[PDB]
Amino acid sequence: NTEGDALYSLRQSLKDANNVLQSWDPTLVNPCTWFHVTCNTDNSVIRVDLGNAQLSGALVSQLGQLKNLQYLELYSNNISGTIPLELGNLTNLVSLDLYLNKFTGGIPDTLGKLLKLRFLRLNNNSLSGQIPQSLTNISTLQVLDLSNNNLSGAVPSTGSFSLFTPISFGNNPNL
Template identity: 45%
Template sequence: MNIRTEISVLVCCLVFSCMSTSGSPSNGVGSEVMALMGIKSFLVDPIGVLENWDEASPDPCSWSMVTCSADGHVIGLGAPSQGLSGVLAPSIGNLTNIQTVLLQDNNISGNIPSEIGKLSKLQNLDLSNNNFCGQIPTTFSHLKNLEFLRLTGNNLSGEIPASLANLTDLHLM
C-alpha cells in the first residue's frame, strides 16, 4: 500500500470513529448533563453530595445520586435526606428518560416545576417532607407511567387536580 492510500484509510477511520461516537447516548454529553447542571445550580448543597457533578466530566453515570440505564441515559435521581435546599430547577423537565426522582426529606422550596409533566417515562416521584409551596402542577396529568407519587409534608395549597384520577397506573399517592 502506498503512503497516499494509507493516509486515506487513516482519515476514513478517524472520520468514521468521530461520527460513531459523537452521537452516542452512553457518553452522557448533551441535554441530560445540562439538565443536571441546571438542577445543581438551583440547589444549595451544604454537605457536598453533588460535588462531583461537573460539566467538565460529561458522564453523569459516574456522578453521585444519579442512576443510568445500560445504554447511558439518566433514569434516576436519588438524593433523599441530604440537607439540600434552594429550588428545584425547571431543567428537570429535560431528563426525558428519567423514571425515578427521590428528593424527599430535604429543605427544597418554591413551586414544584410544571416541567416535571414532560417526563413521560417517570414512574416514581417522591418530593415529600420539603418546603414546596403552591399547587400541584396540572401537567402531572401527562405522567401516564406514574405509579408512585408522594408530596406529603410540604406547604402545598389548592385542590388535587382532578386530572390525576386519569393516571391509571398510579397506585400510591
C-alpha cells in the same frame, strides 16, 4: 449532553451544606460516572437518588429534558419554592417522591399526562389550591399520600381515586 447540563443547572440552584454534589463535573461527556446518578446500558439517566441529603434552595424548570428518568427522589430536605410545570414532560416517570420539604403553591395541571406513574407522595408540605381532576386519568397510579398540606376544593371520586381510602387525603381541614 443535555442531561448533564440540566443536572448542573439543578446543582447551581441548590445550596448544599456537606457538599454532596462535589463530583458533578460539567465537563464530562456523560453524567453516568457521577455520584447519586444511575444510568441504563445506553448511557441515559434513569435514576437520581438525593434522599436525606442536607440541601436547600429551589428546583428548576430544566428538569424536563431527562426523557428516560424513572425514579426521582428529593425527600427529607429543606427545598422551598413551587413545583415546576414542566414535570409533566417526563413520560417515563414511574415514581415521584417529594415529601418532607417546604414546597408551596399548587399541584400543577401537567401531572395528568403521566400514564406510567405508580407512586405519588407529597407528605409534609405547604401546597395549596385544589386537587386537579387529571389525576383520575392515571389508571396505573397505585400509591397516593396527599396529606399534611393546605389543599382545598373537592376530592375526586372517579377512576383510580375510587380504590383509595381516606388515609390518602388526611390532615386537610379545608378539603
